[PDB]
Design an enzyme around this catalytic site. Structure first.
Site, mmCIF file in Angstrom:
data_model
loop_
_atom_site.group_PDB
_atom_site.id
_atom_site.type_symbol
_atom_site.label_atom_id
_atom_site.label_comp_id
_atom_site.label_asym_id
_atom_site.label_seq_id
_atom_site.Cartn_x
_atom_site.Cartn_y
_atom_site.Cartn_z
ATOM 1 N N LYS A 43 6.296 17.578 -10.782
ATOM 2 C CA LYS A 43 5.462 17.964 -11.920
ATOM 3 C C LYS A 43 6.231 18.684 -13.028
ATOM 4 O O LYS A 43 5.907 18.508 -14.188
ATOM 5 C CB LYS A 43 4.351 18.902 -11.433
ATOM 6 C CG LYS A 43 3.081 18.200 -10.947
ATOM 7 C CD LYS A 43 1.971 19.268 -10.816
ATOM 8 C CE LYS A 43 1.742 19.849 -9.411
ATOM 9 N NZ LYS A 43 2.791 19.753 -8.373
ATOM 10 N N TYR A 44 7.241 19.478 -12.647
ATOM 11 C CA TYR A 44 7.896 20.422 -13.571
ATOM 12 C C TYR A 44 9.348 20.093 -13.924
ATOM 13 O O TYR A 44 9.882 20.644 -14.897
ATOM 14 C CB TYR A 44 7.800 21.859 -13.057
ATOM 15 C CG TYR A 44 6.389 22.286 -12.812
ATOM 16 C CD1 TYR A 44 5.547 22.542 -13.892
ATOM 17 C CD2 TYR A 44 5.872 22.368 -11.516
ATOM 18 C CE1 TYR A 44 4.241 22.897 -13.701
ATOM 19 C CE2 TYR A 44 4.529 22.733 -11.302
ATOM 20 C CZ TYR A 44 3.733 22.997 -12.407
ATOM 21 O OH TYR A 44 2.417 23.358 -12.285
ATOM 22 N N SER A 45 9.970 19.198 -13.164
ATOM 23 C CA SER A 45 11.396 18.906 -13.362
ATOM 24 C C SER A 45 11.811 17.546 -12.852
ATOM 25 O O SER A 45 11.102 16.916 -12.032
ATOM 26 C CB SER A 45 12.249 20.011 -12.698
ATOM 27 O OG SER A 45 12.168 19.953 -11.268
ATOM 28 N N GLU A 46 12.969 17.087 -13.350
ATOM 29 C CA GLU A 46 13.724 15.976 -12.777
ATOM 30 C C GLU A 46 15.031 16.535 -12.259
ATOM 31 O O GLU A 46 15.607 17.475 -12.848
ATOM 32 C CB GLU A 46 14.065 14.926 -13.800
ATOM 33 C CG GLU A 46 12.992 13.913 -14.085
ATOM 34 C CD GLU A 46 13.183 13.336 -15.442
ATOM 35 O OE1 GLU A 46 13.059 14.109 -16.427
ATOM 36 O OE2 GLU A 46 13.500 12.130 -15.539
ATOM 37 N N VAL A 47 15.481 15.983 -11.141
ATOM 38 C CA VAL A 47 16.639 16.533 -10.454
ATOM 39 C C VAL A 47 17.661 15.431 -10.260
ATOM 40 O O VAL A 47 17.312 14.320 -9.878
ATOM 41 C CB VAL A 47 16.226 17.183 -9.093
ATOM 42 C CG1 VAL A 47 17.404 17.681 -8.367
ATOM 43 C CG2 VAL A 47 15.317 18.385 -9.368
ATOM 44 N N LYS A 62 18.973 20.426 -12.667
ATOM 45 C CA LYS A 62 17.526 20.390 -12.648
ATOM 46 C C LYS A 62 17.128 20.408 -14.091
ATOM 47 O O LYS A 62 17.286 21.437 -14.737
ATOM 48 C CB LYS A 62 17.004 21.628 -11.914
ATOM 49 C CG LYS A 62 15.535 21.566 -11.579
ATOM 50 C CD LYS A 62 15.016 22.964 -11.217
ATOM 51 C CE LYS A 62 13.605 22.924 -10.634
ATOM 52 N NZ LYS A 62 13.222 24.347 -10.360
ATOM 53 N N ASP A 150 5.824 28.671 -2.528
ATOM 54 C CA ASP A 150 5.810 27.267 -2.386
ATOM 55 C C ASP A 150 6.695 26.760 -1.236
ATOM 56 O O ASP A 150 7.437 25.775 -1.361
ATOM 57 C CB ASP A 150 6.238 26.621 -3.734
ATOM 58 C CG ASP A 150 5.781 25.187 -3.854
ATOM 59 O OD1 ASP A 150 4.886 24.705 -3.092
ATOM 60 O OD2 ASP A 150 6.340 24.513 -4.769
HETATM 61 BR BR1 LIG Z 1 18.118 22.961 -6.357
HETATM 62 C C1 LIG Z 1 17.970 21.251 -5.564
HETATM 63 C C2 LIG Z 1 18.940 20.822 -4.672
HETATM 64 BR BR2 LIG Z 1 20.402 21.943 -4.253
HETATM 65 C C3 LIG Z 1 18.839 19.570 -4.089
HETATM 66 BR BR3 LIG Z 1 20.154 18.972 -2.871
HETATM 67 C C4 LIG Z 1 17.757 18.762 -4.410
HETATM 68 C C5 LIG Z 1 17.298 17.417 -4.023
HETATM 69 BR BR4 LIG Z 1 18.267 16.238 -2.740
HETATM 70 N N1 LIG Z 1 16.155 17.076 -4.632
HETATM 71 N N2 LIG Z 1 15.847 18.201 -5.431
HETATM 72 C C6 LIG Z 1 16.779 19.179 -5.302
HETATM 73 C C7 LIG Z 1 16.893 20.438 -5.881
HETATM 74 BR BR5 LIG Z 1 15.581 21.041 -7.099
#
Ligand SMILES: Brc1c(Br)c(Br)c2c(Br)n[nH]c2c1Br
Length: 327
Positions: A43-47, A62, A150
């Site tokens: 909902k809040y971010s793409e990683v 992030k 969370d």
């Molecule tokens: Br902080 C972080 C880290 Br470290 C990782 Br490994 C992941 C992954 Br895999 N999906 N999202 C992530 C986030 Br937000």
């Protein structure tokens, strides 16, 4: 209501520690970090997995969707405060796109394996091991005056080769101040404490201990998620049908809380379902009396009754993990 431990952490600390709105962010250099591949979204971010181009070290980037200043400073201040603590994700840098002002948080890289495929392969020992490491993170954040708010498998990154664990996404996290009334719209549905579901706002670190209990019941019983409610009313229903309504009624009257008439109607009347009733052939190698005693001590309506993270870490369930660590 007040927390039974760490109640005074923010009271004793200088205002700068917890007054996150007074933070002035120190922006890094966007160009130091290149996106390699997307690894998640929410909902809040793409990683994304990325690279630091200076030293060629992997990182996680992030990229934040549009966010209020107050809220981003909260996540940053919490991250900074907890950086270095046991099994806490390490925030390395904060950067922004010059044109759009889109911020990115840069973390240590963790080589995670998807919980949906990882958890079913975990040994009974593995479960004890990872739950213990997750408890280290929670005791630490609680001891530093923070509630994560969370806890769920999606927020627990596990590099299963190095046997290492990081509690991530402090986006919903908050400083604990005795007597403060907090927003109940936190956690993710399947992990929300009864306090959230009944509008008890003056909650505390114990909230995370319910979420941890839900994760744990999911693991030992191989029932993902353990309490599978469709909306927030149904969530309380699912809980009530396991723990029973008598214990719910005692809880409600203790905190002088009344259910919305509609919610009261939905909950109905229910007896307690013993934990053993969830045992079956798939899960059987996982569900010992020590597992159950520990789970029972987490999944209590009354937040004030649940084990503290520090207590949980001492429960005999983990005695082999402690013995191995002491060496
Ligand atoms: Br902080 C972080 C880290 Br470290 C990782 Br490994 C992941 C992954 Br895999 N999906 N999202 C992530 C986030 Br937000």
């Amino acid at each position: 209501s007040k927390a039974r431990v760490y109640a005074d952490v923010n009271v004793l600390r200088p205002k700068e520690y917890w007054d996150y709105e007074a933070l002035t962010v120190q922006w890094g250099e966007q160009d130091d970090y290149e996106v390699v591949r997307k690894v998640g979204r929410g909902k809040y971010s793409e990683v994304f997995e990325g690279i630091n181009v200076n030293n060629n070290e992997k990182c996680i980037i992030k990229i934040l969707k549009p966010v209020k200043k107050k809220k981003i400073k909260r996540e940053i201040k919490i991250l900074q405060n907890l950086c270095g603590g046991p099994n806490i994700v390490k925030l390395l840098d904060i950067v922004r796109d010059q044109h759009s002002k889109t911020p990115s948080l840069i973390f240590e890289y963790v080589n995670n394996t998807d919980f949906k495929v990882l958890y079913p392969t975990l040994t009974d020992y593995d479960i004890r091991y990872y739950i213990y490491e997750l408890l280290k993170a929670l005791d630490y954040c609680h001891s530093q005056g923070i509630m994560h708010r969370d806890v769920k498998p999606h927020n627990v990154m596990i590099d299963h080769e190095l046997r290492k664990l990081r509690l991530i996404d402090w986006g919903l996290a908050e400083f604990y101040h005795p007597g403060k009334e907090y927003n109940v719209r936190v956690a993710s549905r399947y992990f929300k404490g009864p306090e959230l579901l009944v509008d008890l706002q003056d909650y505390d670190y114990s909230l995370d201990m319910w979420s941890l209990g839900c994760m744990f019941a999911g693991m030992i019983f191989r029932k993902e998620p353990f309490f599978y409610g469709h909306d927030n009313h149904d969530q309380l229903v699912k809980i009530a049908k396991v723990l029973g309504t008598d214990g719910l009624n005692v809880y409600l009257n203790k905190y002088r809380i009344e259910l919305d008439p509609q919610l009261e109607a939905l909950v109905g009347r229910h007896s307690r379902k013993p934990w053993l009733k969830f045992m079956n052939a798939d899960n059987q190698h996982l569900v010992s009396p020590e597992a159950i005693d520990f789970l029972d001590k987490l999944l209590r309506y009354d937040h004030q009754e649940r084990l503290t993270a520090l207590e949980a870490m001492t429960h005999p369930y983990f005695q082999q993990v402690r013995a191995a660590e002491n060496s």
